[PDB]
RNA sequence: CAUUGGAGGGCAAGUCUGGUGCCAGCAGCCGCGGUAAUUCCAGCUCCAAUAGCGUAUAUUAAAGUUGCUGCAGUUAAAAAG
RNA sequence: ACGAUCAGAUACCGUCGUAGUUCCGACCAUAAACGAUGCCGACCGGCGAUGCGGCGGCGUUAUUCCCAUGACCCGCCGGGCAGCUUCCGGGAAACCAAAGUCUUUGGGUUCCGGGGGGAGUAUGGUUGCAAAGCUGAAACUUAAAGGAAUUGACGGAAGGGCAC
């Protein structure tokens, strides 16, 4: 979003966007992703629009900051491929994380232990959170999600166009989304490049 | 004595919200009864419709459980239904009471064609469906009373719908889905789009957003 | 020999290996005489099986990251490992080849980067039919 | 609304959904009037004004909601980028 | 079975046809 | 043969409308369904629209709006004797607060209120809401 | 009501289809309705070709197989265990005998 | 089929008449058989002469022997 | 001294009592009488209009169970091979 | 027809076997002639696979071929042959992209059902050599016949643990 070219397209994103592999999603396409592509290979994959990607990503940041008081929004997966990323996003953001194992009824069943009252739902992927996405359609709380050319896209209100298969691309996405959201919050006045590097959000079998 | 649990009902006790409007703008899942048992304190006029037992057949004395229809109204525009299945007639009655207390649905009212006075009926010609019963509702002016079977008669007067023509394309002898259909018809008055409509609302920010002050507490 | 064990010991283990763990034994005899003081049960039948399954727990404790118990050592060590020092990886890797299709796309953005024009053009027939 | 002589047509104004130019009913669950923060565009920082989005509930199942709010944001002018 | 209900009717129809045509 | 592009308009618009597309394109057209479009505009149900010129059928693109429910087409083509007008009003269209049955007669195109105002009736072809 | 999708035969866009007859059953059914397996094997249905090789002119010969288009009727398939039933949805998905 | 043209009455009314010829509430009062075979010629009364008095059986569910007269 | 139909639900009143014991009768529908009968015959009591009440048979409405408004044809009776 | 099978087996099952199965000429007009589901017309989600023609040409491959052109190759289009999933929506459900765009009742138009039985019967006509086909009531017995789905038990239906 925005009319500030500094938040908008800069080399500061591409120098890492091309490094990860952010310009390739997957072989096939569902009929709700055509908005976010410009070219096609001769090789069987679709190369997404990273500009539209940053566009709706900044809209995602807008949604995340319209959280007037952060204590009340869930960032969720149940797959370890983004479990680390959601943990380390929530730890630094303040909104609560759920990852690995979910329990239907936490924010749907009226009577429940860990009866949590979110106010926005963040999911790593619709193919990754079947039941929580349905429950987000059940209770009036908006939904933000990554979106591949392959992926089913149902009930998605805020779309982030990128491949969500890979630790490298998804780690770039979390690691730059954190900076973008805090940027539009204003704690980051373009003073520094952020010292955390994308290897931090490429999932690890922890032996360190 | 009594305590809220869910955030919205806890606010409603925390009365900073005064009307069901700050809810039925958003169509909120109001997952606890006592919200509208705060909104009202008395005058909750009821009627215990009926008891239908339903049983499963086994090798032994087959197992039967009873369903009790009851309805709530205020002769003004508030109306609702409570349907509960229980071991006993007593528990069925109480479950119908609670479900009918939570199931309240206010209605968009109007006239038979007049533009003065106090609204008394559906705005226009509508129809409500479920089961096999399609009940077509038609308004009716002053002096025209209630034109129904007992079920639409009640569930319109108790809906504050005073004068009315009912029509049925299906079997009213099927009271259950008859009641559900004749309540869906009342429920859908906001579906039509009129020149009295067709604007853009002012987005009176969520009870949550405006009143976060208590919302971050637990 | 033996039998598959019950909830009264599943709970009695996933409480004590949670709290008493660091103070919990390493072998059966120790486990049982720990149970004598810091267990409250109406028998010795439950106590013997608690001690046997705690023997099982120490069999399972130092056995690598183990998914059948939970203890402080595990909790901290995994969190601390995740508390990590990214090696020099902002560039994410060394020199990058990319496709002319991606270059022509990034022409719209009027963008480039460290580039080598990876050529992978012709196809040999594709997804199986 | 409540007209002067009592031409009462609204008991109130239900939350209208503009993402598809269609009205909804009283008992919905996917008609979500989300808020969106406004920027200062001296640093891009959040500032105290609302860009709102309330789509009719049913379209979410079709999964057009992303596209509709794309159109809404572009029109709203907080999103200007177009390829 | 309706097949042999029909066959019974067929045979009885032949009976009545001949008993009527005879005289 | 293919028939009644008026009916086909009233089916195609309602085919696309509940699917929610902002505008619609219809292959055939006529000056008279254009005239229904204009009567629809005078109440504002639809917006402005474009008339794509291809002498073969004439295509119409028209915007759909939340000002509408549906509009019916009646073949056979009756006549309103100006006795039956109130009958048709009360038995076809859902509302006297909006929606006004349509008539082709000897005083121009019109909907039933304006028809009654000029005191001339005729054929029913349309009724909207 | 119909507890099948194409009713166990592939007549789809075409007229009445040829007959073929079971051999565990000697019953005639249309070819679309029938069940068709293609079996190949060696002569002795076990490893006796090792014995055949033990005393042989050539060491062991290239073993011309037997190829057969095995036919069953539906009911002989049931009696002789080609397949069996599937769930009220699991009939939809397929896994023929290898 | 179900056709709906305007001047169709030559098909409409005659086919409708023919398709009316199925209701009991039509047959039982629009062909001579009903009147000419009602057990009497049609009267709320049936005066006559008793010729004997007997008992009539019932079916064994409600077993009974009711008092019936041949008129 | 004013009655005519009821006293099970449907369908407006008694989980009425002596009987009688599937017995007569009631029940247009269900079933009720097969000794611990809310359907029979009587006593009180109550239900419904009322100088009325039904009985019985033609007539209508309910009806979208004639489809003109305005039917259905996979399975329900229904589409010529 | 004959051996067994079995109280009956006139049957299954085993052995022969006229008519039938075969051809040609004229009849015979039927059924689960079942997608039990008219026909013409438009539209409404996708693709995993399909068949022909017209067609855009990376890389294959073949004739001395680039340019004639076969198999390819990723595919567009047209109406064709289809499966899968999806709340598009309808119904009582199974389910069906049609059994959808139906009370928010109407693109056009041939067949046709009116509670069950009596009954495809009588009767009359008409074709048939024949058996029958088309045509088609009535008195009379009835307040139930009927479908759709859930639970019990049945199964010499199968697939799995277990009892001396």
From Swiss-Prot, chain C:
- N6-succinyllysine modification, residue list: 19
Give the matching InterPro entries.
Ribosomal_eS17, Ribosomal_eS17_CS, Ribosomal_eS17_sf
PANTHER family to which the protein is assigned, alphabetical: 40S RIBOSOMAL PROTEIN S17
Principal subcellular localisation of the protein? cytoplasm
- What Gene Ontology terms for biological process does this UniProt record contain? translation
Q: Which residues carry this modification: Phosphoserine?
A: 113
Q: Which family does it belong to?
A: Belongs to the eukaryotic ribosomal protein eS17 family.
State where the record puts the cross-link Glycyl lysine isopeptide (Lys-Gly) (interchain with G-Cter in SUMO2).
Answer: 103
Record PTM: Ubiquitinated at Lys-103 by RNF14 and RNF25 in response to ribosome collisions (ribosome stalling).
Instruction: Decide whether keyword Nucleus is in the record.
Output: yes
Q: Which HAMAP family match?
A: Ribosomal_eS17
Origin organism is Oryctolagus cuniculus (Rabbit)
Got a GO cellular component term for this one? nucleolus
- Which residues form the Glycyl lysine isopeptide (Lys-Gly) (interchain with G-Cter in SUMO1) crosslink? 103
Q: What is this protein called?
A: Small ribosomal subunit protein eS17
Function field:
Component of the small ribosomal subunit. The ribosome is a large ribonucleoprotein complex responsible for the synthesis of proteins in the cell. Part of the small subunit (SSU) processome, first precursor of the small eukaryotic ribosomal subunit. During the assembly of the SSU processome in the nucleolus, many ribosome biogenesis factors, an RNA chaperone and ribosomal proteins associate with the nascent pre-rRNA and work in concert to generate RNA folding, modifications, rearrangements and cleavage as well as targeted degradation of pre-ribosomal RNA by the RNA exosome.
The entry lists its GO molecular-function terms as: structural constituent of ribosome
Matches recorded under Gene3D superfamilies: Ribosomal protein S17e-like
Q: How does it assemble?
A: Component of the small ribosomal subunit. Part of the small subunit (SSU) processome, composed of more than 70 proteins and the RNA chaperone small nucleolar RNA (snoRNA) U3.
Q: Which domain of life does this protein belong to?
A: Eukaryota
Gene designation per UniProt: RPS17
Places the protein is found: Cytoplasm; Nucleus, Nucleolus
Q: Which SUPFAM superfamilies would you find in this protein's record?
A: Rps17e-like
The stretch of residues making up the signal peptide is none
Swiss-Prot record, chain E:
- Can you state the subunit structure given in the record? Component of the small ribosomal subunit.
Q: Which GO terms describe its biological process?
A: translation
Which Pfam families does its entry note?
Ribosomal_L41 (PF05162)
In its UniProt entry, the species of origin is given as Oryctolagus cuniculus (Rabbit)
This protein's GO cellular component annotations are: cytoplasm; ribonucleoprotein complex; ribosome
Spell out the InterPro entries in the cross-references: Ribosomal_eS32
Keywords annotated in UniProt: Cytoplasm, Ribonucleoprotein, Ribosomal protein
Q: Where in the cell is it found?
A: Cytoplasm
Which residue ranges does the record annotate as region Disordered?
A: 1-23
What is the official name of this protein in its record? Small ribosomal subunit protein eS32
Outline what the protein does. Component of the small ribosomal subunit. The ribosome is a large ribonucleoprotein complex responsible for the synthesis of proteins in the cell. Interacts with the beta subunit of protein kinase CKII and stimulates phosphorylation of DNA topoisomerase II alpha by CKII.
* Family according to the record: Belongs to the eukaryotic ribosomal protein eS32 family.
- Give GO terms: molecular function aspect only: structural constituent of ribosome
Swiss-Prot record, chain G:
Compartment annotation: Cytoplasm, Cytosol; Cytoplasm; Rough endoplasmic reticulum
Phosphoserine modified-residue sites? 53
The processes (GO biological process) annotated in the record are: cytoplasmic translation
**Where is the sequence biased in composition, kind Basic and acidic residues?**
86-96
User: What does the UniProt keyword field contain?
Assistant: Cytoplasm, Endoplasmic reticulum, Phosphoprotein, Ribonucleoprotein, Ribosomal protein
Any one Gene Ontology MF annotation carried by this entry is: structural constituent of ribosome
* Organism domain of life: Eukaryota
Primary location recorded for the protein, binned into one broad class = cytoplasm
> Mind naming one GO cellular-component term on file for this protein?
cytoplasmic side of rough endoplasmic reticulum membrane
* PROSITE patterns assigned to the protein according to its UniProt record, in alphabetical order: RIBOSOMAL_S26E
Biological role stated in the UniProt entry? Component of the small ribosomal subunit. The ribosome is a large ribonucleoprotein complex responsible for the synthesis of proteins in the cell.
Q: Which family, according to UniProt?
A: Belongs to the eukaryotic ribosomal protein eS26 family.
Self-association and partners: Component of the 40S small ribosomal subunit.
Write down what this protein is called.
Small ribosomal subunit protein eS26
**Gene name, Swiss-Prot/TrEMBL:** RPS26
Curated annotation (Swiss-Prot), chain H:
Comp. bias (Basic residues): 1-19
Record's family?
A: Belongs to the universal ribosomal protein uS12 family.
What is the annotated localization of this protein? Cytoplasm, Cytosol; Cytoplasm; Rough endoplasmic reticulum; Nucleus, Nucleolus
Recount the PTM note: Hydroxylation at Pro-61 affects translation termination efficiency.
What is this protein called in UniProt?
Small ribosomal subunit protein uS12
Where in the sequence is N6-succinyllysine found? Answer: 53
Task: Please tell me where this chain falls within the complete protein, as first and last residue plus total length.
Answer: 2 to 72 of 143
Q: What exactly does this protein do? A: Component of the ribosome, a large ribonucleoprotein complex responsible for the synthesis of proteins in the cell. The small ribosomal subunit (SSU) binds messenger RNAs (mRNAs) and translates the encoded message by selecting cognate aminoacyl-transfer RNA (tRNA) molecules. The large subunit (LSU) contains the ribosomal catalytic site termed the peptidyl transferase center (PTC), which catalyzes the formation of peptide bonds, thereby polymerizing the amino acids delivered by tRNAs into a polypeptide chain.
Swiss-Prot/TrEMBL puts the cross-link Glycyl lysine isopeptide (Lys-Gly) (interchain with G-Cter in SUMO2) at 36
Q: How does it assemble?
A: Component of the 40S small ribosomal subunit. Part of the small subunit (SSU) processome, composed of more than 70 proteins and the RNA chaperone small nucleolar RNA (snoRNA) U3.
3-hydroxyproline PTM positions: 61
Highest taxon in the source lineage: Eukaryota
Tell me which species this is from: Oryctolagus cuniculus
Where is region (Disordered) located? Answer: 1-25
């Amino acid at each position: 979003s925005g009319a500030l070219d500094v938040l908008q397209m800069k080399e500061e994103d591409v120098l890492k966007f091309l490094a990860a592999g952010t310009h390739l999603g997957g072989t096939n396409l569902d009929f709700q992703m055509e908005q976010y592509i410009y070219k096609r290979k001769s090789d069987g994959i679709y190369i997404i629009n990273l500009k539209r990607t940053w566009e709706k990503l900044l809209l995602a940041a807008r949604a995340i900051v319209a959280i007037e008081n952060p204590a009340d929004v869930s960032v969720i997966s149940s797959r370890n491929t983004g479990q680390r990323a959601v943990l380390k996003f929530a730890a630094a953001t303040g909104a609560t994380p759920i990852a690995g194992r979910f329990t239907p009824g936490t924010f749907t069943n009226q009577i429940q232990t860990a009866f949590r009252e979110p106010r926005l739902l963040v999911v790593t992927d619709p193919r990754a959170d079947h039941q929580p996405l349905t429950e987000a359609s059940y209770v009036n709380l908006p939904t933000i999600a990554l979106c591949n050319t392959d992926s089913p896209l149902r009930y998605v209100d805020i779309a982030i166009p990128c491949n969500n298969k890979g630790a490298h691309s998804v780690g770039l996405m979390w690691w730059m989304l954190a900076r973008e959201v805090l940027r539009m919050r204003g704690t980051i006045s373009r003073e520094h490049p952020w010292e955390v590097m994308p290897d931090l959000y490429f999932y690890r079998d922890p032996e360190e | 004595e009594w305590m809220p649990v869910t955030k919205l009902g806890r606010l409603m006790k925390d009365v900073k919200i005064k009307s069901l409007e700050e809810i039925y703008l958003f169509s909120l899942p109001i997952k606890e009864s006592e919200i509208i048992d705060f909104f009202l304190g008395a005058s909750l006029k009821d009627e215990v419709l009926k008891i239908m037992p339903v049983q499963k057949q086994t090798r032994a004395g087959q197992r039967t459980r009873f369903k009790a229809f009851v309805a709530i109204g205020d002769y003004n525009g508030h109306v609702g239904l409570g349907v509960k299945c229980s071991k006993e007639v007593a528990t069925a009655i109480r479950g119908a009471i609670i479900l009918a207390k939570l199931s309240i649905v206010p209605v968009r009212r109007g006239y038979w064609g007049n533009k003065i006075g106090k609204p008394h009926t559906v705005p226009c010609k509508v129809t409500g469906r479920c089961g096999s019963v399609l009940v077509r509702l038609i308004p009716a002016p002053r002096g025209t009373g209630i034109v129904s079977a007992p079920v639409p008669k009640k569930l319109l007067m108790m809906a504050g719908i005073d004068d009315c023509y009912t029509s049925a394309r299906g079997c009213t002898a099927t009271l259950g889905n008859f009641a559900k259909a004749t309540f869906d018809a009342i429920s859908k008055t906001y579906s039509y789009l009129t020149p009295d409509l067709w604007k853009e609302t002012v987005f009176t920010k969520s009870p949550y957003q405006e009143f976060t002050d208590h919302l971050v507490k637990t | 020999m033996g039998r598959v064990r019950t909830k009264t010991v599943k709970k009695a283990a996933r409480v004590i290996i949670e709290k008493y763990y660091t103070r919990l034994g390493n072998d059966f005899h120790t486990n049982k005489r720990v149970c004598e003081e810091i267990a409250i049960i109406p028998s010795k039948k439950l106590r013997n099986k608690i001690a046997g399954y705690v023997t099982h727990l120490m069999k399972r404790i130092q056995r690598g990251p183990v998914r059948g118990i939970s203890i402080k050592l595990q909790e901290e060590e995994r969190e601390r490992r995740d508390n990590y020092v990214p090696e020099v990886s902002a560039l994410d890797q060394e020199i990058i080849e990319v496709d002319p299709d991606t270059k022509e796309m990034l022409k719209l953005l009027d963008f480039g980067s460290l580039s080598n024009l990876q050529v992978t053009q012709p196809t040999v027939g594709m997804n199986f039919k | 609304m409540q007209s002067n002589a009592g031409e009462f047509v609204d008991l109130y104004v239900p939350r209208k959904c503009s993402a598809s130019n269609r009205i909804i009913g009283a008992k919905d669950h996917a008609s979500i009037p989300m808020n969106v923060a406004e920027v200062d565009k001296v640093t891009g920082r959040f500032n105290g004004q609302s860009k709102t989005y309330a789509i009719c509930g049913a379209i979410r199942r079709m999964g057009e909601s992303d596209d509709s709010i794309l159109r809404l944001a572009k029109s709203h002018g907080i999103v200007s980028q177009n390829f | 079975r309706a097949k042999w209900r029909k066959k019974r009717m067929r045979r009885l129809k032949r009976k009545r046809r001949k008993m009527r045509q005879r005289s | 043969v293919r028939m009644n592009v008026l009916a086909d308009a009233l089916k195609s618009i309602n085919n696309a409308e509940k699917r929610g597309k902002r505008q619609v394109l219809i292959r055939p057209c006529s000056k008279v369904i254009v005239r229904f479009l204009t009567v629809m505009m005078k109440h504002g149900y639809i917006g402005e629209f474009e008339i794509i010129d291809d002498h073969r059928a004439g295509k119409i693109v028209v915007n759909l709006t939340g000002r509408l429910n549906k509009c019916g087409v009646i073949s056979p083509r009756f006549d309103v004797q100006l006795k039956d007008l109130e009958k048709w009003q009360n038995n076809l269209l859902p509302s006297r607060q909006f929606g006004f049955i349509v008539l082709t007669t000897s005083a121009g195109i019109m909907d039933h209120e304006e028809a009654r105002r000029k005191h001339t009736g005729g054929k029913i072809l349309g009724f909207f809401f | 009501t119909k507890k099948r999708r194409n009713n166990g035969r592939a007549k789809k866009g075409r007229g009445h289809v040829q007959p073929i007859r079971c051999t565990n059953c000697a019953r005639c059914v249309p070819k679309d309705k029938a069940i068709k397996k293609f079996v190949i094997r060696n002569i002795v249905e076990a490893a006796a070709v090792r014995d055949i090789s033990e005393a042989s002119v050539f060491d062991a010969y290239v073993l011309p197989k037997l190829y057969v288009k095995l036919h069953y009727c539906v009911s002989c398939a049931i009696h002789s265990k080609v397949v069996r039933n599937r769930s009220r949805e699991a009939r939809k998905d397929r896994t023929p005998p290898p | 089929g179900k056709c709906r043209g305007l001047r169709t009455a030559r098909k409409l009314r005659s086919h409708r008449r023919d398709q009316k010829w199925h209701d009991k509430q039509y047959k039982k009062a629009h062909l001579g058989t009903a009147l000419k075979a009602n057990p009497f010629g049609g009267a709320s009364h049936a005066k006559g002469i008793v010729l004997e008095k007997v008992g009539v059986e019932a079916k064994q569910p409600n077993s009974a022997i009711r008092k019936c007269v041949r008129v």
